[PDB]
Design a binder for these strands. Sequence first.
RNA 1: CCCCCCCGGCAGCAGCACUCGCCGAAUCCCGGGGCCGAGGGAGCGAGACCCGUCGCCGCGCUCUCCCCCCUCGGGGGGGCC
RNA 2: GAGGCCACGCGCGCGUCCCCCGAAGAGGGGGACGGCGGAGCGAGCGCACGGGGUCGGCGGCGACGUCGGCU
RNA 3: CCCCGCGGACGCUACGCCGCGACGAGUAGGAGGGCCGCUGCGGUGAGCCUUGAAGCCUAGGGCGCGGGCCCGGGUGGAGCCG
Lengths: 52, 63, 225, 240
Amino acid sequence: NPLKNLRIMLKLNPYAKTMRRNTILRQARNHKLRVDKAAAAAAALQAKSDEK
Amino acid sequence: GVDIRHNKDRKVRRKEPKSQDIYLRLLVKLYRFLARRTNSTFNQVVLKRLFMSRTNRPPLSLS
Amino acid sequence: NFAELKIKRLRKKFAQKMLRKARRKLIYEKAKHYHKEYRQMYRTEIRMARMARKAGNFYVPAEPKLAFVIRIRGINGVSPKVRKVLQLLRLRQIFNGTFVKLNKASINMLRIVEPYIAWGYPNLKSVNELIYKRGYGKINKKRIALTDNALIARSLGKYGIICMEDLIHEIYTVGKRFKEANNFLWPFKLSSPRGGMKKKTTHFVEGGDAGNREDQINRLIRRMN
Amino acid sequence: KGKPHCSRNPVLVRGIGRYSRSAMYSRKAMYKRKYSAAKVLATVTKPVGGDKNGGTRVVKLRKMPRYYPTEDVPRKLLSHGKKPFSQHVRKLRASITPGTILIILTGRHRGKRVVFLKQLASGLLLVTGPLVLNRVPLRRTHQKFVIATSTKIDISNVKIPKHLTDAYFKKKKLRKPRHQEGEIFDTEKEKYEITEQRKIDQKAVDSQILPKIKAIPQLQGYLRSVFALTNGIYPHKLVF
RNA sequence: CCCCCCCGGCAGCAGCACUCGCCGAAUCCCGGGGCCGAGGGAGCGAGACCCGUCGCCGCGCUCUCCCCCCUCGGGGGGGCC
RNA sequence: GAGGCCACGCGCGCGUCCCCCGAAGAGGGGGACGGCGGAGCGAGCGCACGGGGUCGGCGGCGACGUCGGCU
RNA sequence: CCCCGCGGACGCUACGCCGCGACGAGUAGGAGGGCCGCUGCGGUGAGCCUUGAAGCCUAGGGCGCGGGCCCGGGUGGAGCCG
Ligand SMILES: [Mg+2]
Ligand SMILES: [Mg+2]
Ligand SMILES: [Mg+2]
Ligand SMILES: [Mg+2]
Ligand SMILES: [Mg+2]
Ligand SMILES: [Mg+2]
Ligand SMILES: [Mg+2]
Ligand SMILES: [Mg+2]
Ligand SMILES: [Mg+2]
């Protein structure tokens, strides 16, 4: 089966590797952004509550 | 189940001579090879005529 | 002449390898171009609907030109007209699937077999899942699995279709050579719907499964193959 | 020749590298590394010796077979996988970390609680529920047949001897050389003997695991007891 | 409490406060359980000789040179226009 | 002008476009693209989601009592 | 110009062997195959057999989808089978 076997898909569709690589890179970038954005919100929440 | 009809599955045709003539069978062997290993459609027609019955191989007069 | 014949075979082998290399680069770049085309179509419908709503108007999309038809009833007690049309749709078995190009002639055929089929409008994903997992070619009257691109090119290369991506592009965007590319595909032999059906004996709009479910055919397809 | 380099294409998912074909082309500097153009003796000559025997003899190695069987078996096709067991990747469950208390499920040490030390080259776990506690020596075990509990001791900075390998623990056999038909009983040597080396290794590891066991209260009592299923308790509701 | 505001601002956003969707060229990663292992001479090459670790496909290193970080030659990285 | 991507990477000559001076907007000097032009060749190790399973993994037990025999 | 090696599996009853794909209900009825079975004749097996044929019996061992068949043990006493 393609869609389950990477090399079988690449034999039929060589462009599937760059789409898959771009997706994995993009999803890691988006995940990192949402993690850092959320931590900043918590850090601002802590700062606005323990500002003294 | 599949919606097909099985009454015409088997094609009725001569795959070999019904005769037991060993000289006819030897030159059927020769033309079975020549039909398979050449692109000549002449050898294909001659091979299938060798299979045919006597009534399907009528005599040819000299005239 | 041993040295010269070695050179001849090396040159012939190297020439064939370069031809394979060039054909692989073409296949790679066509899929890159198709990916650009697919996202342009997807964004355009969103963009057209947005400018209509901005002006207070209504954007009516193009009527779908591709259908996936699934036969859902068996082969027992079928009237002769329904039996004939199902054969013309290449649906001779239950849970068989076939892509159908939609027009007046084909739609009126779908109305006749309406209690016997479930159909709808496949999206890009459904076409990819069907061709990649269950795509078989009718090659020399034989059901051959689409495991190599050379099987498509030898049968459909005269139409410009030389890879899985070209076959998918022709099916999805109903092209000039849809009839040849669609008839090349052996009709899809799908499994039973995992999770069951609602009711195969009534229409979809009345709580059942028969008839035209517009784009819910994709939900059916995911469970079906 | 040149010194080997690292891959220069980091893996991000198995089978997919982080960089594309052109990106790896520039990383490798393939634009300047462009190349266009520029055994075993089967027979041996040996001096045969002796007068008028000729000079030497062209003695060939690997003489042709003396006998051929009446029929053979065709050779196999090729499989592009199916590595030998020694080349398999060894997988360990995340709940089994060095120092984890395990529960043995099979064997004569059934139900005993032991201490996990390290995974061996075959993937078998090396455990020692210390011999002074529950009579389990340094012994191999299979991760499929153990239960990893939650309680752990920090067995970091202890020194497991390096000779403690799979070959160290592999069973030894005597039978059967110089003996074909059994008319005198060969039941001797059936008494497995504990080597002095095994006792030395047992003492060496246990001398530095036992103080860490005594560090937390009544863990030694826990290790002395065995695991059992009471009629009220069910393994699917138990947190281990 | 509801509606209209002269207008809102901030965060989040079909919500990791489980109110209500349709999806994936706008989709990828990982894990677990079950059943199965059919086939058996794939070598254009050396003129094979240990049982063809072979084809297609996807990659890594070397035939260039500098560095960097751990081990004590080995391992892991940055590249080099 | 203090990042990302590319299945972009030899020369020579020819073409197409862009830039400079342009002393006839001549004539040369530079970039980009090319599917154009008469002339042979990369090899050497590996890893594998790659034309259907293997282990270059292992254990226990065996004569008057037990082992196998779906018939 | 092969040769430090003088060497290199199996196959192809061609009425044989090998590959790929689809398919498999069945009365009346039709057809094909039968190394299914019975009896006798021409050939053939330098076939079997009083050191035991045919037949029969058998909680014995098997083969074939099947028709059926082979082998062991007993009984039997002169013929039998491919
Ligand atoms: Mg059927
Ligand atoms: Mg029928
Ligand atoms: Mg019915
Ligand atoms: Mg279920
Ligand atoms: Mg009805
Ligand atoms: Mg969301
Ligand atoms: Mg097999
Ligand atoms: Mg039938
Ligand atoms: Mg009948």
